[PDB]
Amino acid sequence: PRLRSTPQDELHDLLCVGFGPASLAIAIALHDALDPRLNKSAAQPKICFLERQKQFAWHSGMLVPGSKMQISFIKDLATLRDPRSSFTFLNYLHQKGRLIHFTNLSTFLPARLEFEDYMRWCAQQFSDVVAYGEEVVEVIPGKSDPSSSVVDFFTVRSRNVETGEISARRTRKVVIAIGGTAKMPSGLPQDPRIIHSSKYCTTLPALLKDKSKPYNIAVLGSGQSAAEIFHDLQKRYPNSRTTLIMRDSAMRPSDDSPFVNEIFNPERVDKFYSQSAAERQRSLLADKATNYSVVRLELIEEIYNDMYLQRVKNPDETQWQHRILPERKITRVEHHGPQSRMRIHLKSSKPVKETLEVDALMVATGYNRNAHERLLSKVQHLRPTGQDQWKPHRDYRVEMDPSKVSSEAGIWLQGCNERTHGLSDSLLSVLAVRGGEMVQSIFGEQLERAA
Amino acid sequence: PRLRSTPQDELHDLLCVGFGPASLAIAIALHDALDPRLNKSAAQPKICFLERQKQFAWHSGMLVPGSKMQISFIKDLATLRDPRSSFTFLNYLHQKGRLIHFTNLSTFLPARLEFEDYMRWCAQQFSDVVAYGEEVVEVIPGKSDPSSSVVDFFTVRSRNVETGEISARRTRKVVIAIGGTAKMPSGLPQDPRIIHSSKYCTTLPALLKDKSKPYNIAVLGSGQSAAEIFHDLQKRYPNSRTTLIMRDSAMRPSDDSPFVNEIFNPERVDKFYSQSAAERQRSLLADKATNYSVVRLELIEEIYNDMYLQRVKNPDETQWQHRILPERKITRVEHHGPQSRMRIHLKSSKPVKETLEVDALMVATGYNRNAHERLLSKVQHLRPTGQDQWKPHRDYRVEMDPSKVSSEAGIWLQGCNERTHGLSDSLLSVLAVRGGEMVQSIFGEQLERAA
Amino acid sequence: PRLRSTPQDELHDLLCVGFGPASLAIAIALHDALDPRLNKSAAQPKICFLERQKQFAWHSGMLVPGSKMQISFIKDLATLRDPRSSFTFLNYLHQKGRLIHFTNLSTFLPARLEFEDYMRWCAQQFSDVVAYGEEVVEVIPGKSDPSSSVVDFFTVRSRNVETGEISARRTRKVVIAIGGTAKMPSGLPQDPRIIHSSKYCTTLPALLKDKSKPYNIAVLGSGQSAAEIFHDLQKRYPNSRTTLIMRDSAMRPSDDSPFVNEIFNPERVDKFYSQSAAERQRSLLADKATNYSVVRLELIEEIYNDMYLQRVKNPDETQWQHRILPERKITRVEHHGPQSRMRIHLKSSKPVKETLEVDALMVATGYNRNAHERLLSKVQHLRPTGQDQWKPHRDYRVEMDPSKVSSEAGIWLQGCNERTHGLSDSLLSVLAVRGGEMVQSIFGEQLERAA
Amino acid sequence: PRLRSTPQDELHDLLCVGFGPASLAIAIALHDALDPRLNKSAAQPKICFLERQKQFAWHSGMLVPGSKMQISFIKDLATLRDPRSSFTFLNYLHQKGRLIHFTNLSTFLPARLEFEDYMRWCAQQFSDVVAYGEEVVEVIPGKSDPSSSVVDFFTVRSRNVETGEISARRTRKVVIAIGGTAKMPSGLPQDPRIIHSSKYCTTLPALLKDKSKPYNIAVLGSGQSAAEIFHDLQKRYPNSRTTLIMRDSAMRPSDDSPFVNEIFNPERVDKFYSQSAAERQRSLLADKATNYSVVRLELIEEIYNDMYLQRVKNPDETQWQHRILPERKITRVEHHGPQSRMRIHLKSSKPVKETLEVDALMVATGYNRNAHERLLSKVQHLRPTGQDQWKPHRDYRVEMDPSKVSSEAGIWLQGCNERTHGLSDSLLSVLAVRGGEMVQSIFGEQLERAA
Ligand SMILES: Cc1cc2nc3c(=O)[nH]c(=O)nc-3n(C[C@H](O)[C@H](O)[C@H](O)COP(=O)(O)OP(=O)(O)OC[C@H]3O[C@@H](n4cnc5c(N)ncnc54)[C@H](O)[C@@H]3O)c2cc1C
Ligand SMILES: Cc1cc2nc3c(=O)[nH]c(=O)nc-3n(C[C@H](O)[C@H](O)[C@H](O)COP(=O)(O)OP(=O)(O)OC[C@H]3O[C@@H](n4cnc5c(N)ncnc54)[C@H](O)[C@@H]3O)c2cc1C
Ligand SMILES: Cc1cc2nc3c(=O)[nH]c(=O)nc-3n(C[C@H](O)[C@H](O)[C@H](O)COP(=O)(O)OP(=O)(O)OC[C@H]3O[C@@H](n4cnc5c(N)ncnc54)[C@H](O)[C@@H]3O)c2cc1C
Ligand SMILES: Cc1cc2nc3c(=O)[nH]c(=O)nc-3n(C[C@H](O)[C@H](O)[C@H](O)COP(=O)(O)OP(=O)(O)OC[C@H]3O[C@@H](n4cnc5c(N)ncnc54)[C@H](O)[C@@H]3O)c2cc1C
């Protein structure tokens, strides 16, 4: 099958906000559900994806040279749902003439560059139904009978990133799959020299143009992003003096041990979801080291080894080209001085220390997943009376007042539901299976008519 | 699609001798070629497989506990030809409800027990076209016009392993895929206590019945089979005294390094085949350590570690429970004595040493691949005049005198062609791709009519 | 030098309670301080060690086959203080004729069996100054002038483990290095079938005598001890049905990552000690995963793999020979029934489940380090007024009222000071350096006279 | 003890030619034999070492960034002889304040930079007895009674590398420990752009000065040196186009498997030496993959991975920045052209291909160990009549006619005796033990007088 485009003016069955991996997994699952080769029961649903980037890209600001996936390739966008799918990583390799060559690597962990290209190869097959350069700015409730008190569609308004014009599309069902936004410490001032990890590859080279210059560059944080940037900077700027600032005492290893890791299994979502709010909070805390503020062991070991080599060359740590400053917090940033370097004031992170002069501060402090709140502000009144937070059901559809919203209309959330669905929610871990679940939840009636 | 059985009395399009992995890969490729889901161009060919075992089994005498595949699961019976195939290892796992669980192991190397079950799961889907308990004993030339000098079919005669009756099936094309036979040193006498590695799991427990008894058991050889048996015996018979006898100075590691390993790539068969006899002989020798008389490093290290632990317990090697005797050869076996133990006489393997008294000698000396010669003795006269060896073309069809044999008739060899096709010939390495190549070579005309 | 014995009746310079690794490291450091070859400045101090075991043994109840050290051999009993010492692991190997052979293993982690033998080899060299089979039962204050209010020696009373007779030795200085006692859940009743991990190898075989019998054996806990026992039982009793009961959701991996692991460095003791009580408590919690309720990754992976193999054989987890039951707690133990099996009642560990019938319950719930409290009850009054807990100084000497105790008398604690000295206190990590520090603290005046 | 210098004019007991690791191990063993702390039996022997380098350096032309030892640190210059020695790698680390830090790396394989510094630290302690900048040019026989026919000393003549003046020293005993000389293919012409691997770090940067320039650089060979240079060039010159030319089909992995590796054990020298010439030749061939024309697996895998990444970026191998050209041999080098690039003509190495234009050719073709022949030309007549090759005894002393040479005079060879003493001869493997053996062989009489 081949998904054809729907004219902008027609009522859509589904409109998806964002075309990152989460939305792409839904597109793939729909294709597969409509394929007679895979689904024996298999008109076309009217679907559109809106993506603010001008083309498909996966965390392009963090495509650090040599960076690797932290998940088995088997957990791609189709395999766990159907290994026979044309959208598996192995079939992508076969199509590229690279399958035997990848096999000879004996690794489950492709370069992030390669995995992005896999997803790009998948994404390109849906170009007819994806509108790029469209930033969704609001979702507005709609009534086919404006005199009634029942909402039965939604209008999704997006802004063209190049022209700035506003387009509207109407749909019975909306999916919001917009990932996360850069989290910045509230104490830090705004400055072109202060840059979030998410914009590392895309904006730092424009600030620090000469790769041979002895720049002083600090990195704030101790998670995977902070470690990757710290390590890369030492290769990208060979004569630089880099400094890793962390409030913890040390970089800590990610837990990928097999029993613990079973929390990422697709079948575990049912189990997690059915737990109480207290139990879910308890569970997420207990398993935090699988995902948050943690670094892959291999990378920790490499950075440690690099530090040891500095010790061999010079026993005085204060003279090392690259340094780590643990149990520190930034208390003041001077950035109005005549020189191109900022002055960073540090204290102990325990409940006055040194001063650093730097050309740039990379801030690897993670992400927030609350941007859907702003997009859904105008539909908040459709929630049950007195409810001031969106409550996703197991099938990811948000709860709305049944007396206010028709059964045929709804809004689903994707990627922002860790609190209710578990640690796998924001990752690639369950995307293949979740895509299949989403297609059933959204298009079930049509698929049942064929079944 | 589903391959239906052909009545014994009808002329077959293809008859395959053996239903091990090589024949199974052909069955799978044919299924896939006939599947409209995978091949858009896709009556049924008349096909039968004859297998001497009573059911599908893969080296059952060597299904040693804990034994592992020495090849990536990606090199299964379909993936390298088509990752979308229902016969991939990953789809097998999915069907069994085990895919996520295998993923969590982070290994490319399943237990041999698991891989056999994968192949058994594949094999069971062809039960309608496989006759088990049928040992093929001869291939006889046939002439549709007996007064002419042109052969245009073959009669394949098989012996029922239970009843002993002789059945005949006629076919235009024959494939011989019968693997290897046990290679035994010519100096060794016949004795129930002298057993080839291929019969280890199936016959040794019948000889040495009490698992707690202090048996003396020797193992001859230094390849993967010898190492696996040596290591297993120490677990199976905890109180036994085992001795590894080898003519080499040491167990040597298998070469699985990535550049060298590319010799096993499916596309390399073309390159190898087109080389001269001298070059091919040279090439096979240079790369011998990838496959022959070699042990997986991990297993060498485990055995070595076990030996070290014996040293900790006792510094006198002569007192060790389990011993390795390198650079030795057996010169005499006494096995007519009144006691249940044989007397093995050893000398240096260099161009008189000790004596061992043992309850059993496991002989792990490898395999010969010449059994097709006996089966094809009655068709030898169809080869070009003066040719006293079978010459497989690139497509595995043996050369026959075109003035004696019709273009529609032929015999293909599988698994015994290392001399012409390379080190991957006897392994699982190229089976998926080779199956596809075989289906084209044998059924091409029919498939072209559909294409 | 060679430490000669002191007659029981003479006033000792030092008496050490316990001859485990901590006391042995002090003996070694004293030898080394007195050796002219190592210390250029170098009468004999009057010293005695009292050990309740009949000979040197290191956690003999947990010398599980195949069990390994969780610390580099470089952190032996001398190397970190002086690599030239005759008491290094490498010199032990050299003396045994095993150095080259160990080198060829390429491991930093010897078998626990080997490391015990290293320590036994060290211990045997101090046989003249160690009294075995002597259980210290009390430390009594002594006054050379009984009419005065100043304590200037201590009497250490011990009970002969064979004869039961009481011996007394007088000393100016005492070291208490008695390790830990078995920690048992308070809810469990006393029963010969309920056995702590510390008595696994020494007492379980006496209870379950027939190694081939299909016993049901449970294990309580999820730390290294629980994992080792769980794994071993499956080898020791091949036909048994084992069950691992844990309150956590999963076995979690030990953190041995290099930055975090620096907390075990000898120089870090100064840093840890100088922190506030609050900071120390915070620090110990943050780094808990380096030592407590954690399993070596390799062992987790092996157990996981064994579980997967059960899945291959049978997809129904309830039928598996060996099982893990996570998030469970024991609420009732029935052990008065006519059968030889106890009935264990389980519930969820979250704030009624199944029932198990077992022949034995192995309880791997860790250790307490409070036994010094009982031994020092009669000297408690020498602490500063109102102080109801022993307060070790940096040099491990407990604080006593200077107006009550002479400067030449004192009591040191070893191995029970994690709260004040850090996570390395109970381990082998800092023993070499700590031994040297202890010798200076205790014998400094004599050593200064030579210096 | 401290070895004092001998005036140039005095008769020496020993003169050693070369102060690389082999001579340094002798110096260390002598120190240790004379140390009362280690040898209880312990005037000073008159000794001098002559070294052509201006200071101690270990293969400085191949101190490639990130390069690692291929041998356990335990096989340092003392440990296998005496772990108590002050000259062990661990004691070096302790002295540098780095022991705990190295321990935390969990590696047996220090950087070559670190190991050189270890050896430099050892070497500096013998500065009084080492004359640097002295290139030995000949050994001349000497007779204390010139009218007699008996040689009883040797004169060693050396050339000052700075002034060019000739100095002579007289000695009863000589050791030649001069390592190897650069082996170059005889077909290659002399050119500043054609450089042996041994001069990579020291001379290539002087030829290719701009690290950012898009140079074309070829590497000839497929051993460890060729792989290290190939890999490093890609980092040193990021915009370069590198090409690895090899006559073999692939880089092959070094055999470091534990049983095979036992050939490097010090005790194995006795066993190897006592074999016949035929057996020794056979043995060296069988074990070639442990040392010659082989690459460490880890490095092969890294290079392979780098090649795969090029494939991801571009499926056309001809466009890759860095390429490997297997089964090739150089037949013509054009190097008289007006451009700065040479033209290299390649053919198949099998019994016309492409053309490469390159700025430099690195030639990693190994070493010869025959330079002692030139130095000993004037003493050849002292060998038994008709003997045209030097024959080292087990103790490394060359055979001389007893009627021509006094028992108190002799010449020993070190590092060039693989044919007679085995594969460990040229390596660090047996240096500690061999040093001890050499001290006994040379100074035994003096040491026996003390014993
Ligand atoms: C550097 C990095 C590496 C990672 N690597 C891994 C890994 O190895 N394995 C793993 O499982 N997880 C990984 N993750 C986790 C990651 O969250 C998932 O891989 C994945 O990106 C989640 O997909 P998503 O579609 O939910 O969110 P995203 O990938 O963020 O996609 C959301 C999309 O919505 C678009 N969008 C946002 N706002 C709007 C708007 N208003 N209108 C229109 N479009 C909009 C964005 O442009 C984006 O394309 C990584 C995360 C980071 C930051
Ligand atoms: C113990 C062991 C482990 C191995 N593991 C691996 C591995 O991990 N990876 C890998 O790539 N290679 C491995 N191999 C190599 C092995 O040769 C292939 O895996 C595979 O078995 C080859 O398949 P085949 O069909 O050519 O031969 P076989 O597997 O031997 O199958 C031939 C079949 O023909 C039947 N047969 C024989 N004679 C007759 C007759 N006269 N009439 C009818 N039927 C007959 C036999 O019963 C058998 O079923 C292993 C080999 C051994 C011995
Ligand atoms: C199974 C196990 C394995 C371990 N493995 C490691 C490892 O790999 N690495 C590591 O660093 N740590 C390990 N540890 C931590 C362990 O605590 C230390 O290795 C070490 O045992 C501490 O030595 P110690 O002398 O302080 O205590 P102990 O080893 O317990 O020694 C105390 C001694 O005092 C004796 N004693 C007790 N009471 C009396 C009395 N009243 N009178 C006389 N004598 C008495 C005891 O018999 C004992 O010999 C392990 C612990 C366990 C339980
Ligand atoms: C790049 C490289 C890396 C290696 N790494 C390892 C390793 O990891 N492990 C290992 O076991 N082996 C290794 N080797 C093997 C190596 O041969 C030994 O490590 C070691 O160098 C042998 O020591 P030697 O003293 O015999 O020879 P050399 O190290 O070559 O020392 C000989 C010395 O004699 C001097 N000399 C030469 N001619 C004269 C003269 N006419 N007069 C005066 N002085 C002279 C030289 O300047 C030199 O200092 C490596 C070899 C190379 C090339």
Ligand SMILES: NCCC[C@H](N)C(=O)O
């Ligand atoms: N940060 C990525 C975590 C991936 C997870 N361990 C999984 O297997 O799904």
Ligand SMILES: NCCC[C@H](N)C(=O)O
């Ligand atoms: N449980 C033993 C921990 C040992 C510690 N990682 C150390 O290196 O000292």
Ligand SMILES: NCCC[C@H](N)C(=O)O
């Ligand atoms: N090329 C160095 C080889 C070192 C050798 N495997 C050894 O252990 O001595």
